[PDB]
Design a protein around this ligand. Structure first.
Ligand SMILES: O=C1C=C[C@H]([C@H](Cl)C(=O)O)O1
Ligand SMILES: O=C1C=C[C@H]([C@H](Cl)C(=O)O)O1
Ligand SMILES: O=C1C=C[C@H]([C@H](Cl)C(=O)O)O1
Ligand SMILES: O=C1C=C[C@H]([C@H](Cl)C(=O)O)O1
Ligand SMILES: O=C1C=C[C@H]([C@H](Cl)C(=O)O)O1
Ligand SMILES: O=C1C=C[C@H]([C@H](Cl)C(=O)O)O1
Ligand SMILES: O=C1C=C[C@H]([C@H](Cl)C(=O)O)O1
Ligand SMILES: O=C1C=C[C@H]([C@H](Cl)C(=O)O)O1
Ligand SMILES: O=C1C=C[C@H]([C@H](Cl)C(=O)O)O1
Ligand SMILES: O=C1C=C[C@H]([C@H](Cl)C(=O)O)O1
Ligand SMILES: [Cl-]
Ligand SMILES: [Cl-]
Ligand SMILES: [Cl-]
Ligand SMILES: [Cl-]
Ligand SMILES: [Cl-]
Ligand SMILES: [Cl-]
Ligand SMILES: [Cl-]
Ligand SMILES: [Cl-]
Ligand SMILES: [Cl-]
Ligand SMILES: [Cl-]
Ligand SMILES: [Cl-]
Ligand SMILES: [Cl-]
Ligand SMILES: [Cl-]
Ligand SMILES: [Cl-]
Lengths: 91, 92, 92, 92, 91, 92, 94, 94, 94, 89
C-alpha cells in the first residue's frame, strides 16, 4: 500500500550541534534500512527546505505509524500523510 | 530533473457526455506517450478524488510548462508544481 | 484498514426533481449494501449540514477508491480521506 | 449523544522525560476507565501524528467538557469538537 | 443544550422574483415559531452581511439537525455549528 | 450595542499553579462585576476548550477595548471581535 | 465610531458594460452623499483591485448595516467589517 | 504615497511587564515623532487586540521600510503592507 | 519604484473562442508596449499555470493601478500586489 | 533556469554575533550575485526577508546553494520555478 508522506524538520534553536549530528546519522542509518527492505520506496529532498517528500510501501496503517513514530527526527517533524491508489492510465 | 505535480480535475456539469469521453481517452493516450518516453515518471491516483500525484522528469521549467499546458484536461485542472532534489540519504 | 472519510454534498440548483430523489434512493441503497457488508462501518450525519462523517473498513487504498468512486453522489461530493491506526490506549 | 473529537498532542521542548512518562501512564489509565464506563466510545490513532480521533457518547455538552477538561494531556492538547447526528441511511 | 450557529445566505441571481419573495416570508414565519417556542433562543444580524449569529436551545443533536434541515433557506445556507457549555463564572 | 467576542486562552508553560489559581479567581471576579453591570451580557464556555464565547453590550468600540484590555487573562488571550446588528426577523 | 471596511467587487458575467457604467454612476452618487455627511470618512482604491478600503464613522452597528445594505454594489460585494478604537499613542485626530 | 499597514504585537512569554512598559514608552515616543512629521498619517487601535491599523504617507517603498524597521516593537511585530490608490469616487482629501 | 505582481487568469469555459483570441492578442500588444516603456520591467510565466510573475517599475501606486486596470485580461484576473525595496546586499541595479 | 525564491528571517530571541551572520550573509550573497546565480535581490518592504530570482542549472544546484546560506537555519523559504513568457520582449 502506497502513501505520500511529506516531512518538514523544525529543529529547536537550542539543539546542540553534537546532538544534531547524532540525530542526522541515526536518521540516515534508519532510512537506509527501511529503503533497502522496500518500505521506504522513494525519498526526495524538498528543494530549499529541511525536509523531504517520500513514498512508503507498507501493509497497514498500523505499520506506517510505527515506522514514522520511530523516525529519529519525529520530535521535530511536521508530517502529512495521504493514501495513493493505482491509476488506471498508469503504464 | 524532477518535479512533484498534483493535479485535481473539475469537470463542469454541462459537459457534453461525448466531449467528456473524448477527453478521458485523449488524456489516457497522451499520458501513455509521456510515460513511455520517461518524462512522466510516476503516476498515482489520489484516493477518493478525481486527480493524481505525479513525478515529471524534464530538462527545464519551460519543457514542463509546455507539457502541462498541452494536456487535454488542462483547462479543467488545478495544478501545483514543486521542484524535487536528490536526497543525500537516498539509497539507489 | 480504517479510514475517516468526510463527505459534503453540493448539488446543482438546476438538478431535475425526479432525478434528485432517484439519486437519494440510489445512494441509500448503495450505502445499505456497503454497511451490511461491513466495508462502510460507521455512518453519522454532520449536524446542520448535507454530508456525513464515515469510517470505512477495507483491504486497501484501491478498494476504498473504487467504492467511493462508485457512489451515486460522487460527482457532487467533496471528500476528505485520512487513515486511522490502532491506538495502544484502546480498550479491547 | 455523539461527538467526534480530534486531539493533537503538542509537547513542550523542555518537558521532563520522567514527567512525560507519568502523563502517558496517567492518560492511558483515565482513557481506559472512560471507555469502560461507555463515555469514550471510539479511540483511534491519527496515523503519523501524536493524537487521536475519538467518538464520545455523553448526555450533554457540559458533561463532555468536564471530561475533556480532566484529561491529563489537556494542557498540551489542541482539541476539535463536532456534534454527530443519526443518519437516515444508517443500517442498524 | 445550547448551540452557537452561524448562517450565511447565498441566494442565486437567477432566482424567480416571486419564488424568492415567498421564500423570505416563509423563513420569517418559521423563525418566528421557533423563537416563540424557545428553540431559537437568540438571533442577531451579522453586520455588513446577509446572515445571522444564532443560539439554539434543543434537547439533542438530532433535534437541531432536523430544525436546520427544515429551514426554508437551508439549500442556500452555509452553516457552522458548535456546542456551548455553562461557564463556571456565569452570573 | 452588541459584540460577539470569542476568547481562547493559551497559558505559557512556566506559569505556576498559584499564578494560574490567582489569575482564575481574578478573572471570575472581574467578569462577575461586568455581568452585573450589564456590559458582559452573555458568557458561555467553548466546549472542550479553555475559553469562551461572549456577547458584550457597550456604547462604543473604545469602551469594549478598555474592558477587554483590562481582563486578567488578556495577555494570554486570542480574541475575535465582530459587531452584531438587530435582525428583522427577531422576536424580542 | 470608526469601522474599517474592505469591499471587493465580483460582477456577474451577464452584467454588460452599459449596465456597469450606470452602476458606477449610482454608486458614485450614493458614496458622495455619505462622504459629504461624514459617515463615509475615508475612501481608498485597493491598488490593482476592483473594490475599496474604507473607514466609516457611524453611531451604531445597525446604522452601518443599513448603509452597507443600501450600497448599489452590495449584491456583488464581499465585505469585511472591523471596529477601530482610539490609540493611546495617537497624536492628532482620528 | 499612502500605505495601509497592519501591525500585530506578539510578545515573548519571557518578556516581563516592566520591559514591556519600557518598550511601550519608546514606541510611543518614536511614533509621536513620525506622526508630527506627517509620515505616520493615521493610527488606530484594533479593538480587542494588541496592535494597530495605520496609514503611512511616504515617498517610496525604501522610506517605508526604513521607518518600519526602526520601530521599537519591530522584533515582535507581524506586519502587512498594502499600497493605497486614489479612488475616483473620493470626495475630499485622502 | 518596484512592485511584485502575480496574475492568474480565470477564463470561463463558455468564452467565445474568437473573443479569447482577441484578448490574447490585445494582452500581448498591451504588455509589449508597457515593457518597451520600462514600466513592465520583468515578465515570467508561472510554470504549470495560466498566469505570470511580474515586476513593475512606476512612480506611484496610482500609476500601477491605472495600468493593471487597463489590462485586457483584468476582468478575468486574480491579482496580488506587493512593494519591493532596495536590499542592502544588492550588488548592482534593482 | 529561473526560480522565484521568497525568504523570511526569524532570528532567535537571544543573539549577541547577529552582525556576524549579517556579514557572512552579505559576503555569501555578494559572491553568488557576481557569479550570476543570485540574479535578483529585493527587500520585502516592512519585513525581515527578501524576494530573489535565482538562475541555476538544476534543482540540486539550487538546494545546495540555499542550504549553505548563513541564514538558512533561521529561514522560511518558498521556491517556485519560472518559465519563459511568450509575451516577454
Ligand atoms: O535521512 C533522513 C531522512 C529523514 C531525515 C530528515 Cl526528515 C531529512 O529528510 O533530512 O533525515
Ligand atoms: O489518464 C489521465 C492521466 C491524467 C489525466 C487526469 Cl489529470 C487524471 O489523472 O485522471 O487523465
Ligand atoms: O444515503 C446516503 C449516504 C451517503 C449519501 C450522502 Cl453523501 C449523504 O450522506 O447524504 O447518501
Ligand atoms: O492514552 C491516551 C489517550 C489519549 C491521550 C493522548 Cl491525546 C493520545 O495518545 O491520544 O493519551
Ligand atoms: O427570517 C430569517 C431568519 C433566518 C433566515 C436567514 Cl438565515 C436570515 O435572514 O438570517 O431568515
Ligand atoms: O472567568 C473567566 C472569564 C473569562 C476568563 C477566561 Cl478567558 C475563561 O473564559 O475561562 O476567565
Ligand atoms: O463609487 C463607489 C464606491 C464603492 C463602489 C465600489 Cl465597491 C468601488 O469601490 O468601486 O463604487
Ligand atoms: O505606540 C505604539 C505604536 C505602535 C506600537 C504597537 Cl504596534 C501598538 O501598540 O500598536 O506601539
Ligand atoms: O500577454 C499577456 C501578458 C499578460 C496576460 C496574461 Cl495575465 C498572461 O500572463 O498570459 O496576457
Ligand atoms: O545579506 C543577506 C541576503 C540574504 C540574507 C537575509 Cl535572508 C536577508 O537579509 O534577506 O542576508
Ligand atoms: Cl528521521
Ligand atoms: Cl490530461
Ligand atoms: Cl452516495
Ligand atoms: Cl489525556
Ligand atoms: Cl430560514
Ligand atoms: Cl479574564
Ligand atoms: Cl447597533
Ligand atoms: Cl456601492
Ligand atoms: Cl490600548
Ligand atoms: Cl522605493
Ligand atoms: Cl513600535
Ligand atoms: Cl479605478
Ligand atoms: Cl492582460
Ligand atoms: Cl543568507
Amino acid at each position: 500500500m502506497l502513501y505520500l508522506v511529506r516531512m518538514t524538520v523544525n529543529l529547536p534553536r537550542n539543539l546542540d550541534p553534537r546532538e544534531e549530528e547524532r540525530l542526522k546519522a541515526s536518521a540516515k542509518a534508519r532510512s537506509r534500512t527501511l529503503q533497502e527492505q522496500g518500505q521506504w520506496r522513494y525519498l526526495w529532498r524538498t528543494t530549499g527546505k529541511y525536509g523531504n517528500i517520500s513514498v512508503f510501501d507498507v501493509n497497514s496503517h498500523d505499520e506506517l505509524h510505527e515506522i514514522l513514530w520511530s523516525l529519529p527526527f519525529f520530535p521535530y517533524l511536521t508530517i502529512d500523510v495521504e493514501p495513493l491508489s493505482h491509476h488506471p492510465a498508469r503504464v
